[PDB]
Ligand SMILES: CC(=O)Nc1ccc(Nc2ccc(S(C)(=O)=O)cc2[N+](=O)[O-])cc1
């Protein structure tokens with residue numbers, strides 16, 4: 001009964017109080033740091049095999065953000081873990097009022113496949129920092145990374161506290177019968193409901209980082225040269241397989257073709273004339289997803305790319321024009337290198353378009369006008385927002401990353417990770433003295 | 447069917463953007479303030495009929511805390527709602543980084559019966575302040591308060607935005623099929639799982655204020671006169687029907703009888719020789735609960751009280767001695783005026799006793815030694831903690847109130863209510879100019 005054994009062993013190890021001193025956690029974190037350094041080439045190998053990442057983007061688009069998180073947490077831990085004194089009242093002057101931070105217990109992190117290292121290990125850094133045992137369940141789709149982590153994690157980190165669980169849906173389903181103190185899951189909206197249903201049975205709090213279609217509004221009087229380069233970058237990295245990728249563009253029909261053009265120009269700079277020959281361009285994860293993505297290109301007006309190779313699972317950077325909001329490519333998260341352009345004739349119409357759909361993980365807008373930015377923000381709802389750039393808003397330690405509605409609940413990154421994986425316990429400490437002022441509360445009343 | 451209409455009307459009213467300006471929210475809150483003043487005697491009448499509260503404790507043990515919350519929120523709203531600037535990095539100097547607060551949408555508050563006004567309206571204050579539509583579902587067990595709120599709420603507050611839903615389990619069950627943006631529920635652990643299961647279907651975030659047995663540890667060398675007075679107060683108010691009532695006592699067998707004695711002494715001061723003749727002493731809510739509470743007194747060593755009257759649903763303040771941890775009275779939340787005393791022979795044994803059970807909403811300890819206080823806190827887990835008092839820790843605006851594990855998830859009160867009923871949206875605003883520092887990210891890579 002291996003799953004149950006790993007969980008039981010993790011719980012027992014947590015109960016012994018081993019994780020409580022900050023020294024212990026900082027050292028596990030320092031062990032992770034060494035893992036990342038000593039296994040750099042193996043990590044690159046795994047990412048290359050799974051997603052056709054090269055050595056540069058394997059580091060600068062995934063791994064390096066784990067390191068920065070580790071470095072930041074090690075540094076801020078004593079301050080975060082310290083009891084937090086709070087505002088008193090005229091009646092609680094003599095009292096101590098503070099918030100006490102403590103671990104939840106055993107935490108489950110369920111990873112996903114598009115960034116199989118980062119989206120497994122970054123949440124773990126937080127949960128470790130917060131003093132929890134952490135059970136890991138990597139995605140099977142990132143087969144090479146899943147198998148590597150199961151090997152190297154126990155080589156560096158405490159064996160009982162941080163077990164890795166292998167498998168897929170059947171194994172995952174069985175893991176969710178075990179009692180956890182917190183569950184963090186990154187993946188799809190549909191599975192989020194399953195995680196939550198399973199969590200309810202033990203009243204387990206959850207953090208769900210889910211999906212949706214992240215809109216990208218482009219304004220008329222803005223510099224499209226800068227805009228389209230940034231959009232193309234965030235859209236086409238990892239072959240479009242990014243939760244906060246700009247999924248589609250909204251723009252006035254008068255600027256459509258210029259956008260198409262400036263995108264091509266930027267794409268050619270990134271990946272050359274043929275993207276299949278670029279070491280910087282990725283591949284689709286699985287055969288099933290390759291076909292899903294191809295099927296969305298059908299019956300569409302292609303302005304660029306449009307072709308794919310089933311063997312190596314390559315899809316050329318594709319731009320679609322005059323796209324029908326009801327067509328398949330606009331009815332699901334694309335998660336591939338296909339960028340539809342939908343026309344709207346005003347800011348107000350773009351806002352309405354966004355609000356009639358489920359709330360996205362990210363919302364993007366490009367504009368020189370501060371008032372256009374402020375209005376779209378005030379009148380929409382999304383997990384997070386970036387104006388005049390993409391992706392970057394989820395890499396800053398001071399901005400919590402998370403969804404809302406269908407794109408998720410809860411958040412992590414930086415201090416938020418510590419908070420998410422802790423219980424914040426309200427404490428009141430009074431002196432035990434006969435206080436004559438408190439005698440009014442006691443019966444009988446006058 | 448008319449449940450569906452109320453929700454739809456509430457959603458449409460929220461969609462119109464009516465709740466967004468702070469002016470509107472403050473107005474609704476000022477209307478609630480008016481309600482509490484103009485309906486003071488009707489509220490007292492309802493609480494007297496349901497729980498045998500008198501006019502003094504109806505106000506000072508319930509209603510006054512709604513008022514303080516309203517006054518505090520009105521005052522702090524502009525500050526809380528304001529965009530919150532966050533720490534920058536050397537690379538985001540030119541940028542704007544802030545957290546934007548926005549309503550979730552339509553909020554459901556499901557109330558409970560023991561404090562049928564406070565535990566319905568206090569959460570509502572927060573959800574209103576945060577700019578949501580708020581659907582209310584009062585507990586049917588507090589039949590008089592449930593029926594009153596359905597009458598008076600629409601007289602003072604916006605009719606579409608803040609509907610009251612009448613009924614019980616069947617009506618509640620049907621309400622949970624509707625799509626909400628947040629659900630707050632106060633009640634039992636068992637029903638919490640149902641709420642959460644229903645919430646998963648729409649990925650609705652939940653705040654669960656649940657139950658458990660709140661322990662009260664009494665140390666050997668502390669002044670038992672002050673201790674037992676405070677314990678008896680918190681234990682026996684509202685006839686023991688309090689989520690954060692000290693449920694049982696843990697103490698060394700050497701101080702047991704003194705405790706029993708000092709409790710009697712305090713009880714006699716509160717409610718006279720016969721508590722049935724005191725207008726300050728409450729009654730059990732329902733016939734079903736009266737019997738539940740009586741059945742827990744059986745086969746137990748009674749040291750005081752022990753008798754009850756089925757007609758008026760009165761149970762005398764009861765103290766049980768040398769109680770077996772395995773007996774019924776120690777295997778469920780008492781929620782009645784029956785105080786068991788369980789013997790432990792050390793602090794370490796008390797800690798172990800607490801940790802082997804489900805996590806309680808509150809943990810109480812009485813001691814002159816701060817090192818004993820600090821140790822029990824560090825080595826246990828509970829929703830909140832009070833040392834050398836009871837109840838009071840959940841009445842301070844700066845201490846979030848909520849559970850952990852089986853005692854619940856999430857929290858509210860003060861600023862936390864505002865946060866809980868909002869989405870905290872991370873915003874990054876960059877200038878749309880050229881940035882040569884950004885060039886390093888674009889392919890082709892080194
Ligand atoms: C900031 C920058 O220049 N480049 C850059 C490149 C890649 C990333 N990574 C990155 C991008 C998106 C996502 S997600 C959650 O939307 O799938 C996750 C990561 N991640 O954590 O690895 C983050 C930043």
Ligand SMILES: CC(=O)Nc1ccc(Nc2ccc(S(C)(=O)=O)cc2[N+](=O)[O-])cc1
Pocket residue numbers: 441506507508511560561564565687688689690691837838841
């Ligand atoms: C602070 C003080 O002296 N007395 C005092 C007396 C009564 C209360 N009320 C009070 C006590 C407990 C609970 S609960 C959630 O545990 O059921 C709720 C309320 N309530 O309705 O606000 C709060 C404070």
